[PDB]
């Protein structure tokens, strides 16, 4: 009907007017007198070897010592970052893996990819080996991300413009999230594990609600696909990294845009976004083989994590904020400090 | 300066490394082919000659081929195409009998243009398959070809085919200096497609070896 042509437009106009009225000044004006962080130096403390193909994802454990990585060679290695040992090496059924996760309790890991199936593995077994515990199916597109809520629940985002919450024992979809008009590429979980956000190719991000399962807010402003997202440690803001060489920081309460992190010399897209423990540093992985760190309150490039020979595809920061680990397509993991 | 448990963990890690190296060495000796098409274009015939990703394994002359079909993905093609950046060859299947149906020839040409000029497939050679020879001949000897290509100016015969069709398909490849394109007619009962695939793979492997040697 024609109603989509006038009520939708007037509601969008009302939203824009409300956002503009609620905007008095910028974050830069508030943090104009803040002392700059200054130049930051980071060195390659460790280097993990053993992968024979491009690395697509990684995740830190809750003890800040163990991490899991996934690559195209059909392997899922669990490293010991303190001594560069290999605790486990799980052979995947399908080598087209593009995501991985680590359970908060350290008992299970998850992986998925082009097979549209999320697999859950058990690490503490009486037989001494690692065997798949559950295979979740129901998505009609490639699965791009998966995060563990607890030992019993997990959320996933696939290319079929939907996000779903699973129940591991039964294997049925407890809730389904709809509303995106493009491929969903990444998601992040709030610190209280009650809300989460998703970044889709629609050049927009949405804030969902795990409890009842409906979209709460929608954030626009980007100009291309969104490849990464991450929650601020406070839990009232998040950062997105798109393909137009721009990182942006939104705020849930203000429902507006706070800053944009762009430079004239950057033309390549962002593949990963992460924060520091106190939220003063924002780390991003670019396609130009580098990894820039940004003053989250001043939008000033404070350092460069150079030293990779291919595209940086993943990024992670430990829970205690003691190290940064990067993985690139040259099959090498480096733990900076 | 390590303890007994640390030494045992190091030994286990070394064993894991050995297993990983052996698996990688075993896997590096196989040939990977990516299969593309415009849908119901004869891919079923090709796969019978020898949800998501569908893999096929077949052996010829003591060589292990792997064939990937991506027909099950309705999502955007520019978000996962970079996964197959190391495939040795690309197999493209086109149905010659779709020239006067709803137009599909133009869609196949557009898909070929998109695939052949991607920033990722700058080196990988592409093998072109044209199917349905007999039915296409039966159709052309009755229906004119000018309906689908207005610019065509020639007689209506089979000999006119394999011209203004395969040459025009090869004309979409405006990167002739790096990668080659092989075209081969085929039908339901030929039993020789595997030989052509093997020849193309051998040529690609020879070129890759010469490039790696630095010569």
């Amino acid at each position: 009907l024609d109603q989509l042509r006038q009520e939708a437009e007037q509601l969008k106009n009302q939203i824009r007017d409300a956002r503009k009225a609620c905007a008095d000044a910028t974050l830069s004006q508030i943090t104009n007198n803040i002392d700059p962080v200054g130049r930051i130096q980071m060195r390659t403390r460790r280097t993990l070897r053993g992968h024979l193909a491009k690395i697509y994802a990684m995740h830190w454990g809750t003890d800040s010592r163990l991490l899991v990585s996934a690559s195209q060679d059909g392997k899922l290695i669990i490293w010991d970052s303190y001594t560069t040992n290999k605790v486990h090496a799980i052979p995947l059924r399908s080598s087209w893996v593009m995501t991985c996760a680590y359970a908060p309790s350290g008992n299970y890991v998850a992986c998925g990819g082009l097979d549209n199936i999320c697999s859950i593995y058990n690490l503490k077994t009486r037989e001494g080996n690692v065997r798949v515990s559950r295979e979740l199916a129901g998505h009609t597109g490639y699965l791009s991300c998966c995060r563990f809520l607890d030992d019993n629940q997990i959320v996933t985002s696939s290319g079929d413009t939907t996000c779903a919450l699973w129940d591991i024992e039964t294997g049925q979809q407890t809730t389904t999230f709809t509303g995106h008009t493009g491929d969903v590429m990444s998601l992040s979980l709030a610190p209280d594990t009650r809300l989460f956000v998703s970044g889709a190719c629609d050049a927009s991000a949405k804030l969902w609600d795990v409890r009842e399962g409906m979209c709460r807010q929608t954030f626009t402003g980007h100009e291309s696909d969104i490849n990464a997202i991450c929650f601020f440690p406070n839990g009232n803001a998040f950062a997105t990294g798109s393909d137009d060489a721009t990182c942006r920081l939104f705020d849930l309460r203000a429902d507006q845009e706070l800053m944009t992190y762009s430079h004239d010399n950057i033309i390549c897209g962002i593949t990963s976004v992460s924060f520091s423990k106190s939220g003063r540093l924002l780390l991003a992985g670019y396609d130009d083989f580098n990894c820039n760190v940004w003053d989250a309150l001043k939008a000033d490039r404070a350092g460069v994590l150079a030293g990779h020979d291919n595209r940086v595809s993943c990024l992670g920061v430990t829970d205690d904020g003691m190290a940064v680990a990067t993985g690139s397509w040259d099959s090498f993991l480096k733990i900076w400090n | 300066t390590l303890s007994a448990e640390d030494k045992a963990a190091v030994e286990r890690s070394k064993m894991i490394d050995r297993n990983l190296r052996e698996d990688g060495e075993k896997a590096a000796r196989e040939v990977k082919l990516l299969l593309l098409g415009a849908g119901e274009s004869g891919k079923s015939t090709i796969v019978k000659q020898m949800t998501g990703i569908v893999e096929t394994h077949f052996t010829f002359k003591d060589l292990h081929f792997k064939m990937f079909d991506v027909g099950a993905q309705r999502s955007e093609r520019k978000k996962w195409i970079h996964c197959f950046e190391g495939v040795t060859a690309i197999i493209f299947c086109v149905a010659l009998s779709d020239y006067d149906l709803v137009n599909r020839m133009h869609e196949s040409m557009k898909l070929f243009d998109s695939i052949c000029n991607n920033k990722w497939f700058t080196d990988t050679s592409i093998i072109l398959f044209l199917n349905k020879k007999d039915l296409f001949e039966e159709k052309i000897k009755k229906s004119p070809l000018t309906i689908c290509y207005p610019e065509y100016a020639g007689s209506n015969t089979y000999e006119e085919a394999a011209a203004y069709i395969q040459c025009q398909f090869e004309d979409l490849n405006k990167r002739k200096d790096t990668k080659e394109i092989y075209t081969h007619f085929t039908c339901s009962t030929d039993t020789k497609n595997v030989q052509f695939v093997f020849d193309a793979v051998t040529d690609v492997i020879i070129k890759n070896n010469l490039k790696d040697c630095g010569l």
């Epitope: 163990l66 037989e127 080996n129 | 007994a4 448990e5 045992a8």
Partner: single-chain antibody
């Protein structure tokens, strides 16, 4: 389920030889290191030998070095201990203990059933001076084990283990690395202390747990057990 069974005992004349076999079924035998623990009639436990995963590392007790030989058969899941020039001091029941080593693992997890043998006719020292503690159920008891050398390594780990052996049963693992609790063990037990002095605490005492308790180290590969303390009544 997981179980280990071994056999090959009997009566052997002095100076002879006998071959022992351990049959393992129910777990990945290729990824586990296998020990060999003996037990004299009434003189506690004693380490004998060890073989790593892949047979890349073998150690022997100094008492039986040279005379004894230990080997494993991964394809058929069998552990072998070939021994020659047997002496009258080797009459003891032997056990079959598995152990897997990695970050956060639990070595000495499952103990075999045990086989008996009869014969016709450095070196860290621990003290378990206290031997008999008769306590009625419902109370709390404490056990003390002391090491000659401190068991606290540079990396922060304390390689001390606790074992319990109910009467007429194989020993069972209770605590590893002096603070962690083994899987399947009730939370009543709790081990703590410092270097060179360790203790084990039982909060609420009940029935099926009366037996002999042992302490063990894992720093340098000559392994030593305690004298063994037991609970009466």
């Amino acid at each position: 389920d997981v179980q280990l069974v071994e056999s090959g005992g009997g009566l052997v004349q002095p100076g002879g030889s006998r071959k022992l076999s351990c049959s393992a079924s129910g777990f990945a035998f290729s990824s586990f290191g296998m020990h060999w623990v003996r037990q004299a009639p009434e003189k506690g436990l004693e380490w004998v030998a060890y073989i790593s995963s892949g047979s890349g590392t073998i150690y022997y007790a100094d008492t039986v070095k040279g005379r004894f030989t230990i080997s494993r058969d991964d394809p058929k899941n069998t552990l072998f201990l070939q021994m020659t020039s047997l002496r009258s001091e080797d009459t003891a029941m032997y056990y079959c203990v598995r152990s897997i080593y990695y970050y956060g693992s639990s070595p000495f997890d499952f103990w075999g059933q045990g086989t008996t043998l009869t014969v016709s006719s450095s070196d860290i020292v621990m003290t378990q001076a206290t031997s008999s503690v008769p306590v009625t159920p419902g109370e709390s008891v404490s056990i003390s084990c002391r090491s000659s050398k401190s068991l606290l390594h540079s990396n922060g780990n304390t390689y001390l283990y606790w074992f319990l052996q109910r009467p007429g049963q194989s020993p069972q693992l209770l605590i590893y690395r002096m603070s962690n609790l083994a899987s399947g063990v009730p939370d009543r037990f709790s081990g703590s202390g410092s270097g060179t002095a360790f203790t084990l605490t039982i909060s609420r005492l009940e029935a099926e747990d009366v037996g002999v308790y042992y302490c063990m180290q894992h720093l340098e590969y000559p392994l030593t057990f305690g004298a063994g303390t037991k609970l009466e009544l």
